[PDB]
Amino acid sequence: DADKLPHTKVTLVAPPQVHPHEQATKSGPKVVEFTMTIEEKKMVIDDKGTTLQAMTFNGSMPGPTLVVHEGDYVQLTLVNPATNAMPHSVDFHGATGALGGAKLTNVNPGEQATLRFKADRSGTFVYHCAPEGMVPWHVVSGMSGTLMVLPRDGLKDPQGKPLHYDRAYTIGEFDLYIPKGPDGKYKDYATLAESYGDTVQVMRTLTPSHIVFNGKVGALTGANALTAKVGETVLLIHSQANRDTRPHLIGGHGDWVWETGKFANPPQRDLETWFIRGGSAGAALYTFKQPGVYAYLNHNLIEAFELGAAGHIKVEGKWNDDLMKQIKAPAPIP
Amino acid sequence: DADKLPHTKVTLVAPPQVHPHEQATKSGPKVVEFTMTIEEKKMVIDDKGTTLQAMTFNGSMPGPTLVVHEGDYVQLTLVNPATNAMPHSVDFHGATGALGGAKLTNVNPGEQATLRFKADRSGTFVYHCAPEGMVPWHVVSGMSGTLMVLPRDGLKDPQGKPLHYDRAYTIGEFDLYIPKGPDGKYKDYATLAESYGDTVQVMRTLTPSHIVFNGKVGALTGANALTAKVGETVLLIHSQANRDTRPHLIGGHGDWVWETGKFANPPQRDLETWFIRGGSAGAALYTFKQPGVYAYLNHNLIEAFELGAAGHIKVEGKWNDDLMKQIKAPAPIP
Amino acid sequence: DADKLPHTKVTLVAPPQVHPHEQATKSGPKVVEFTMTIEEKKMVIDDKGTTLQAMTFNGSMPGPTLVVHEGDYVQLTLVNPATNAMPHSVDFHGATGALGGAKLTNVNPGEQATLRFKADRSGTFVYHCAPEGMVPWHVVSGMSGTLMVLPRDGLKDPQGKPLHYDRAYTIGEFDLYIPKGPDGKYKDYATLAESYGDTVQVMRTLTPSHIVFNGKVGALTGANALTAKVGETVLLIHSQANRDTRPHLIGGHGDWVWETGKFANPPQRDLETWFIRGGSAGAALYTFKQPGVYAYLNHNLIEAFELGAAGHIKVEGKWNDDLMKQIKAPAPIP
Ligand SMILES: [Cu+2]
Ligand SMILES: [Cu+2]
Ligand SMILES: [Cu+2]
Ligand SMILES: [Cu+2]
Ligand SMILES: [Cu+2]
Ligand SMILES: [Cu+2]
Ligand SMILES: [Zn+2]
Ligand SMILES: [Zn+2]
Ligand SMILES: [Zn+2]
Ligand SMILES: [Zn+2]
Ligand SMILES: [Zn+2]
Ligand SMILES: [Zn+2]
């Protein structure tokens, strides 16, 4: 059909939000049009002013989440402005053929391209830049995000019963490899190209200098904490385009989790910690039962607390003493 | 109900054993009372006398395993004696709210607190210390163990048929980060506080100096080997509160494994090696079919053999030639 | 039965091919005889002539894949020629008892042994050398491969429907630990024994110098690329006997994947990236829908592109515009 089908245009929004969309839908297949514009820029990634010579989709790490339904066609215009120094492309893990689209979206600065592919498989899928010979650098420098392809009748549990979320959040976790000089301080680079050789040396050690949600230590804390309320079901989409992570909600659970991120498979329930394979996006549902400030983090606690892979969720509502109660507050031992 | 329910008191036992308990039970929900007392102490962790400035629940690494049934309430008195230097708390991954209980169990030396929570989800769950600003250090220094919440009707296979174990063992695997001095020898510290800064430096490299079962290289070997017999089904509970591991039984299998450790999910069968995500506890059932000395180990063989993540299981009984037979012993090539 | 049963002899073939075999079979159980001869040799592992003092089964990394059916007995003659310097053995993860067979196959140079075991569990299973006190070194130096034990009625999907492959490939991924001298260049060793101490130092850092498919950077590229055609279903068997990996097919998927590699468990579908636990073999089915050159790689992109864990699959056939179409080729921005 394709060329026969109706088209719709979607306006993308910045992480950690996800653009408005339906879950279960009575709509038939559409060509869903998206546009993204690559921005290279220096970004401050921690609380002591370390910078990253970063590369982004639409100015953010991660790039925005694109949401369609199974059977839809994704039609992306990828724009690489002449103000950028490097060629780029996009590899959609949700797509079939031509290195995910990368061979057909090879754009030099001042060019754009339009790729169409059929989203014939449900799930959360990573997309990332994949320019020939420079793949890992472009990815670790920030160029990834999530395509979510929802089943046309919405999410299902292992018995085929309906599942839903009331709010979606998208978290991209970024293993960064910032070089240091002879003084042990992080290097600051005047240009993207100048960061390259030293960064590759760091990459090859396999030890990140920082591991951050959404582009910086503390990105999802303070004023920028995620929010929910008791009784609300959140979807937490978690992408890691290069390295394994193990998400966990402190004082919560993964009620239903697709850790490999593919919705035609039954989810697991009651998880404490789940596993996102480097090069993938997964999805967890949780319904809040207690108010308070939760942490959502990578449960390698070093990676979380020392290197930056941790955020907060501030939840409104009424405390539930049946679920948890302080029987005796801290007080002197008898 | 809660405040209406009967109470029972459980006496904890040292790993690798697990306190006596029922699997399937005709008992209704209870408030099950536990107590644990934190002990900070220096411990020798390898065969060359390296020490760790350790922190423990009840004097052991891991802390003891607490066993209840789904629908029970866990009521823990946590005691931090004035002979300890640091504040502590407990975060139960099996609990809902208040950072796992951590916000309600913040105990300075000379204090205790009593926390109650509903164990409303079946599985093996990590619990660990989580004091504000010092979480990874307290965890890697030894403060973790397992809460096992058994379904009220016992374990089930993927078709809903009953499964059981005749003996449970609990194995906590500890990634340690022991600093070295300019001479390349491990540092020995006079106090817990003095170990801190140097240990954090090591932690941030993400490379453990040692990875040990149950507190020391060779903890589960020699006189301290696990034991079983042909025909006996063992449960191996495996916790790793900070870092991924991949358990394996040499010459055996995981007959039924919940690698994410949550019993409402169907187990997998016939595993060679399974995966415990950092920040979780999993469970494997195996029924011994051959006598002999098995290894139970982390199948990154470096981590196992060089760094310490390996134990033994000595199994009694009759050799089975149908399962395995030496047809020709080693002898000269013809 | 065993001693009653018919015997068959199988001729092994070099990776990445797998010896001819049936999937579903009307044949009853057999004693299936195999022979392998250990070869120690120096091998060049990258494009700049770095060498590895390697140890192999049948002269290749990985060793050859052995294929039987559930209920068959594997009977392996393991030959260690007097031209080798070291003792060897074999541990079959598919076997039950005696440390996988290792205790019964302990062969010094100039000896051979014959081991029989029942392949009573379906799946892909690692086998590897396991000589007492030298296990990790022998494994990381190249001594591993795959035993595939097919269900007697062939592969099944989660609903019990038949699945099949038209071509099997076997990929062993090898984390290598090549030492360097004071000049920062890789060391070349005159003998296997001389490589030992320095290699163990590298191993303990847990950082591989190289991570290669099938014995060398680029082993599965150029003339040596894997091949298939549109409409053909390939099985990709992936073993990693020491360290975790995360396979991915760029521009493809895992249509059906047993990432833990055990066929009595239902596979997952539509995977972007899957996970092979160190110490295991997994299996993925994919049916090609687009022609072109695909990459099959470890999706830690550093490990793939910088360290060597990547291969190619060249696929013949007709491009499918419904699945993917370049709507606008790269061209100047309007
Ligand atoms: Cu790019
Ligand atoms: Cu990719
Ligand atoms: Cu503590
Ligand atoms: Cu935790
Ligand atoms: Cu060997
Ligand atoms: Cu093994
Ligand atoms: Zn149209
Ligand atoms: Zn809702
Ligand atoms: Zn009461
Ligand atoms: Zn029994
Ligand atoms: Zn015979
Ligand atoms: Zn076919």
CA–CA separation, A192 and A267 (whole Å): 41
Range(s) within chain B of domains with CATH label 2.60.40.420: 1-151, 152-318
Q: Give strand pairing partners of A158.
A: none
Region of A222 (left: φ > 0; alpha: ψ -120 to 50; beta: rest) is: left
**Tokens at residue A315, please?**
């939840």
**Does the CB of B151 have a partner CB in chain A at under 8 Å?**
no
Q: Which residue of B has its CA nearest to A305?
A: B136
CA–CA separation, C280 and C261 (whole Å): 8
Write the CA distances from C237 to A71, A148, C146, C162, C213, integer angstroms.
30, 28, 8, 19, 12
Region of A200 (left: φ > 0; alpha: ψ -120 to 50; beta: rest) is: alpha
Contacts of A289 in chain B (CB under 8 A): 96-97
Q: Which amino acid is at C220?
A: L
**Does the CB of B238 have a partner CB in chain C at under 8 Å?**
no
Catalytic residue among C37, C114, C273, C287: C273
Q: Do B250 and C206 touch (CB under 8 A)?
A: no
Q: Do C250 and A280 touch (CB under 8 A)?
A: no
> If you measure from the C-alpha of residue B130 to the centroid of ligand 3, how many angstroms do you get, rounded to a whole number?
6
Q: Which amino acid is at B10?
A: V
Q: Do C280 and B299 touch (CB under 8 A)?
A: yes
Cβ-nearest to C100 among B250, B302, B326: B250
**Beta-carbon pairs below 8 A across chains B and C:** 165
CA–CA separation, C158 and B273 (whole Å): 22
Question: Does residue B219 contact residue B212 with C-beta atoms inside 8 Å?
Answer: yes
The H or E element that residue C139 is part of is helix C135-140
Q: For chain A, which chains pass the contact test of at least 3 CB pairs under 8 Å?
A: B, C
Interface test with B, best of A312, A321, A325 (most B CBs within 10 A): A325
Question: Does residue A172 contact residue A213 with C-beta atoms inside 8 Å?
Answer: yes
Contacts of A100 in chain C (CB under 8 A): 250-251
Q: Which amino acid is at C292?
A: G
**Does the CB of A316 have a partner CB in chain B at under 8 Å?**
no
> Which residue from C240, C50, C44, C207 is spatially nearest to C139, judged by alpha carbons?
C240
CA–CA separation, B141 and A240 (whole Å): 28
Q: Which amino acid is at A36?
A: M
Collapsing DSSP states into helix, strand and coil, what is residue C142?
coil
Per CATH, the homologous superfamily of domain B152-318 is Cupredoxins -  blue copper proteins (2.60.40.420)
Q: Which amino acid is at A172?
A: G
Half-sphere exposure of A72 (CA within 13 A, CB side): 28
Is B210 flagged in the annotation as binding?
Answer: no
**Does the CB of C223 have a partner CB in chain A at under 8 Å?**
no
Q: Do A324 and B126 touch (CB under 8 A)?
A: no
**Does the CB of A328 have a partner CB in chain B at under 8 Å?**
yes
β-pairing, B280-287 vs B254-258, is antiparallel
Collapsing DSSP states into helix, strand and coil, what is residue C229?
strand
Distance from CA of A84 to the nearest CA of C (A): 13
Phi, psi of A187 (to 5 degrees): -80, 140
Q: Which residue of B has its CA nearest to C129?
A: B301
Phi, psi of B306 (to 5 degrees): -85, -40
Q: Give strand pairing partners of A163.
A: A155
**Does the CB of A126 have a partner CB in chain C at under 8 Å?**
yes
> Which residue from C53, C46, C1, C54 is spatially nearest to C28, judged by alpha carbons?
C1
* Residues of B identified as active-site: 88, 91, 93, 128-129, 138, 143, 248, 272-273, 299
Cβ-nearest to C246 among A77, A100, A277: A277
Question: How was it solved?
Answer: X-ray
Number of H-type helices and E-type strands within chain B: 3, 22
| CA B248-B166-C119 angle, 5° bins | 45
Q: Do A140 and C207 touch (CB under 8 A)?
A: no
Is B166 flagged in the annotation as binding?
Answer: yes
Number of H-type helices and E-type strands within chain C: 3, 22
Q: Which of residues 192-221 of B touch C (CB under 8 A)?
A: 207
Catalytic residue among C36, C86, C105, C128: C128
**Does the CB of A148 have a partner CB in chain C at under 8 Å?**
no
CATH 2.30.40.10 fits B1-151, yes or no: no
Question: Does residue B53 contact residue B59 with C-beta atoms inside 8 Å?
Answer: no
Q: Do C93 and B272 touch (CB under 8 A)?
A: yes
CA–CA separation, C55 and C240 (whole Å): 16
DSSP letter for C303, please: I
- For chain B, what is the radius of gyration of the CA atoms? 21
Q: Do C250 and A91 touch (CB under 8 A)?
A: yes
Q: Do C323 and A126 touch (CB under 8 A)?
A: no
- For chain A, what is the radius of gyration of the CA atoms? 21
Distance from CA of A78 to the nearest CA of C (A): 9
The H or E element that residue C197 is part of is helix C192-204
CA–CA separation, A262 and C254 (whole Å): 11
Q: For chain C, which chains pass the contact test of at least 3 CB pairs under 8 Å?
A: A, B
Provide DSSP, C190-259.
SSHHHHHHHHHHHHHTT--SEEEETTSTTTTSGGG-EEEETT-EEEEEEEESSS-B-EEETT--EEEEET
Ligand nearest to the CA of A301: 4
Overall size of chain C counted in residues: 334
**Is the bond preceding residue A179 a cis peptide, omega within 30 degrees?**
no
Question: Does residue B68 contact residue B51 with C-beta atoms inside 8 Å?
Answer: no
Question: Does residue C272 contact residue A261 with C-beta atoms inside 8 Å?
Answer: yes
CA–CA separation, B119 and B275 (whole Å): 24
Q: Three-state SS string across C263-294, please?
A: CCCCCEEEECECCECCCEEEEEEEECCCCEEE
Q: Which residue of C has its CA nearest to B158?
A: C265
Q: Do B327 and C75 touch (CB under 8 A)?
A: yes
Cβ-nearest to A300 among B100, B117, B242: B242
CA–CA separation, C279 and C284 (whole Å): 17
**Does the CB of C271 have a partner CB in chain A at under 8 Å?**
yes
**Tokens at residue C52, please?**
């590895």
CA–CA separation, A207 and A291 (whole Å): 36
Cβ-nearest to A323 among B82, B96, B260: B96
Q: Which residue of A has its CA nearest to C286?
A: A96
Question: Does residue C47 contact residue C128 with C-beta atoms inside 8 Å?
Answer: no
Q: Which residue of B has its CA nearest to C1?
A: B322
**Tokens at residue B321, please?**
């030639």
Cβ-nearest to A100 among C250, C275, C326: C250
Q: Do A270 and B264 touch (CB under 8 A)?
A: yes
CA–CA separation, C231 and C268 (whole Å): 20
Active-site residue C210, yes or no? no
Ligand nearest to the CA of B7: 9
Cβ-nearest to A326 among B115, B207, B279: B115
**Beta-carbon pairs below 8 A across chains A and B:** 165
b/e map C307-331, b = 16+ CB within 10 Å? bbbbbbbebeeeeeeebbbbeeebe
> Which residue from A300, A68, A307 is spatially nearest to A174, judged by alpha carbons?
A307
Q: Do A323 and B118 touch (CB under 8 A)?
A: yes
Question: Does residue C107 contact residue B330 with C-beta atoms inside 8 Å?
Answer: yes
- For chain C, what is the radius of gyration of the CA atoms? 21
**Does the CB of C100 have a partner CB in chain B at under 8 Å?**
yes
Q: Do B97 and A303 touch (CB under 8 A)?
A: no
Active-site residue A128, yes or no? yes
